[PDB]
Amino acid sequence: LRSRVTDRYWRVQEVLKHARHFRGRKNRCYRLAVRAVTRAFVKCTRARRLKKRSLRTLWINRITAASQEHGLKYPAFIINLIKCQVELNRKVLADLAIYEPKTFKSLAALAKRRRXXXXXXXX
């Protein structure tokens, strides 16, 4: 004949060890701890998936701001960068949009230059 021994108590101890910092019975009771842990992991996956989206949106906002400071909008800047064969990511572009206004000013100048040259070649 077997016994329950320390197995269940150790599993509960582990779950509750992962249940620390939780609020109320969820950091005390085992069942609510598990129920909260599942949700915690699902939210971990989902938020780690949407983190890139949030960061991307934030970067787009920053670059949009820095662009609007120079008189042009975000999409025009993007198009100009595409036709300038610039594969630079929006993260580094935002970092330059913050710390190094000179580089972004140069890119904006080249952007307006390409836009004016295209508008003059089309006419």
Binding site: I63, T64, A97, I98
Partner: protein, 147 residues
Amino acid sequence: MSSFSKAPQQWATFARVWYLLDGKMQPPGKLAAMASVKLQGLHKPVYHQLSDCGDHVVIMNTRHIAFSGNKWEQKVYSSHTGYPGGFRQVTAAQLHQKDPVAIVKLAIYGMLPKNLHRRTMMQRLHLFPDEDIPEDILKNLVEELPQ
């Protein structure tokens, strides 16, 4: 300098800059958009959502605002109380004849995101029907973008 292991860039926080916006015939709610952009701080490359880096916007001559179309008499502002049948309809005309600074403010009040930061940035907004600005004794930056 130095940067370590995939981190977003925000240091601490900075000081907001007070701005001035002119009245006289600019479309209502069309100004509220960019004023909400300045309120959120979306015009700053250093912008952060949680940090609330938004600035302080002061607009003047709100009674000189001009709404196009027939919307003057046709716009109905609803104010309802807890009491039954306490539904109140106030036209833009009469509201302008009474409390004009409310109108534009309401146009801003729907632009901002909800919860805390809404009211937080709402306290950064001040409107006056006529021009008297003791706060102009304090030097501020003036931005002109008429429509």
